[PDB]
Amino acid sequence: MKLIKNGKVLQNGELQQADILIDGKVIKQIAPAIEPSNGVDIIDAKGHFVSPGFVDVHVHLREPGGEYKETIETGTKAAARGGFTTVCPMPNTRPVPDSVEHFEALQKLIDDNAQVRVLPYASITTRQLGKELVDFPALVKEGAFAFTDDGVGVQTASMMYEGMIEAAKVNKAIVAHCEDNSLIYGGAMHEGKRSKELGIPGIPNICESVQIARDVLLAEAAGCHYHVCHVSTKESVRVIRDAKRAGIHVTAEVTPHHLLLTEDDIPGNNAIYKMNPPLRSTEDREALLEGLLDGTIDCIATDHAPHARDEKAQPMEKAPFGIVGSETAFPLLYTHFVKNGDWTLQQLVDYLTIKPCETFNLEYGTLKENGYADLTIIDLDSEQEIKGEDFLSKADNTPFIGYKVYGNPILTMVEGEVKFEG
Ligand SMILES: [Ca+2]
Ligand SMILES: [Ca+2]
Ligand SMILES: [Cl-]
Ligand SMILES: [Cl-]
Ligand SMILES: [Zn+2]
């Protein structure tokens, strides 16, 4: 047994004093006060805010295949430091989780290494080559969270359609990185003012939106739950809004960097600012923010995308796409929108807990009695500077280094086991 003394919890739209008694994997009670019994491990929260653990539906753990970038150990250690207790890693690994053999090998690595709950995505097709559908019921039975189009995969509407029919059969989401291959044009950032100023090839908004517009109609015909990954363009948001209005089961996520930065924030040819989808225009960001606020975009997800230092030191035209984000997500968003803007702590917490869970019909995201002891303790009032030295991730490829932030996690617990202590 464990007891978290002195924390504050959210009730409606206010912080309130409450102690939390934990029995094994579950929490036994949440009470104004509670005296300890026998063999009680003590955690003193010291007045800090106690939140349900964050849930990240889009991370890259890199292992297997890319262990030098990140491992399941380092990646979930980074998640816990960011206050996340559940993450769902993408399938763009080697081997791809596209078979029972590969899923079982992965679950073993998770059992041995994961420091938080890991709900892995399956690919939609064998090796993500987009030529042959995986065995959907077989992967669901091995713990597949969703079936996901990441990388250069599904290349015809027919394959996406057939993939969606299979996911509808197993009551699982098709999750898609919307990117039309012929419309990438070798681009490395948003096609707009800045790409022209820097002489760097850009990616047009249409690369993303046209796939969303196709998939929502394929989803509607298949009767399946379609989820759009990290939305970046103003037109994508429109298409999702129109699709939801038509009664289609589409949901969508936005990343912290797309809420906070635009093409204008890119100081020069710097791959630290290179991710996919790219940081787009002020008009695009305004659309995303509007869409998250009116519910068109369901939740926030990080697209934590660790890469090695020498890789991200190269010019944008050569460097891989991606920035890390598990450790910086909440503090950045809390400081910008809550401490320094209109959002409430409750509103921010919901985008990271209950909303991801409602989207995928998950049981987590709440701080309730009988729920798992999935918690993070966060220091709301002290300022910390974001430094690569502090990252538990193996990587430090992020434009947020140097930012001064409030709302920093100091302790994360997964099923009653302290998994991070700052
Ligand atoms: Ca050029
Ligand atoms: Ca590190
Ligand atoms: Cl959780
Ligand atoms: Cl795929
Ligand atoms: Zn991604």
UniProtKB/Swiss-Prot annotation:
GO terms for biological process: 'de novo' UMP biosynthetic process; purine nucleobase catabolic process. Its EC number is 3.5.2.3. Its cofactor is Zn(2+). The keyword Transcription regulation does not apply. It comes from Staphylococcus aureus (strain MW2). Belongs to the metallo-dependent hydrolases superfamily. DHOase family. Class I DHOase subfamily. HAMAP family: PyrC_classI_B (MF_00220_B). It catalyses: (S)-dihydroorotate + H2O = N-carbamoyl-L-aspartate + H(+). Substrate binds at H60, L61, R62, N92, N276, H307, F321, G322. The lineage of its organism: Bacteria, Bacillati, Bacillota, Bacilli, Bacillales. Catalyzes the reversible cyclization of carbamoyl aspartate to dihydroorotate. The active site is at D303. Zn(2+) 2 binds at D150, H177, H230. Pfam families: Amidohydro_1. The gene is pyrC. GO terms for cellular component: cytoplasm. Keywords: Hydrolase, Metal-binding, Pyrimidine biosynthesis, Zinc. SUPFAM superfamilies: Composite domain of metallo-dependent hydrolases (SSF51338), Metallo-dependent hydrolases (SSF51556). It comes from the Bacteria. The keyword Magnesium does not apply. CDD domains: DHOase_IIa. Binds 2 Zn(2+) ions per subunit. Pathway: Pyrimidine metabolism; UMP biosynthesis via de novo pathway; (S)-dihydroorotate from bicarbonate: step 3/3. InterPro entries: Amidohydro-rel (IPR006680), DHOase (IPR004722), DHOase/Allantoinase_Hydrolase (IPR050138), Dihydroorotase_CS (IPR002195), Metal-dep_hydrolase_composite (IPR011059), Metal_Hydrolase (IPR032466). One of its GO terms (molecular function) is dihydroorotase activity. Zn(2+) 1 binds at H58, H60, D150, D303. This is Dihydroorotase. Gene3D superfamilies: Metal-dependent hydrolases, Urease, subunit C, domain 1.
